[PDB]
Design a protein around this ligand. Structure first.
Ligand SMILES: Oc1ccc(-c2nc(-c3ccc(F)cc3)c(-c3ccncc3)[nH]2)cc1
Length: 127
């Protein structure tokens, strides 16, 4: 059926702060993942209509994607790094839930998650 609206990316009513971890998440983690050879399916919300997947949003009730995460970081939407990391993890998990293990799209997600985890391991300590 129809796509839902994309996740909220800006909220004037919620506090804002810049931290070294959040900057790293934007300038390193997001940047690197975005440029990855397998990033394309994950750079925008799943368009279930265009991809002909009418059951996608019947199955996935917490959608997330890197386009959304980019905007969230840009808009200082997150208060802490964990909130952003959760969004990434949600993105991967959604793919794994919706698709079969071994599907090309799943292997692509797994490769991106591997890179993600490497970058998260080098998350600077909160100064
Ligand atoms: O949580 C999820 C679930 C599914 C997908 C997804 N599947 C697909 C997809 C899977 C199989 C297929 F035949 C054609 C297209 C894509 C996709 C592929 C190429 N270009 C743009 C999008 N993305 C992405 C994230």
């Amino acid at each position: 059926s129809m796509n839902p609206p994309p996740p909220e990316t800006s909220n004037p009513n919620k506090p804002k702060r810049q931290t070294n971890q959040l900057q790293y998440l934007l300038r390193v983690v997001l940047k690197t993942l975005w440029k990855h050879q397998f990033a394309w399916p994950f750079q925008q919300p799943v368009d279930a209509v265009k991809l002909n997947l009418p059951d996608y949003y019947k199955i996935i009730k917490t959608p997330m994607d890197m386009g959304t995460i980019k905007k969230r970081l840009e808009n200082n939407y997150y208060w802490n790094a964990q909130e952003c990391i959760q969004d990434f993890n949600t993105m991967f998990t959604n793919c794994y839930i919706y698709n079969k293990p071994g599907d090309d799209i799943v292997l692509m997600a797994e490769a991106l998650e591997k890179l993600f985890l490497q970058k998260i391991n080098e998350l600077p300590t909160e100064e």
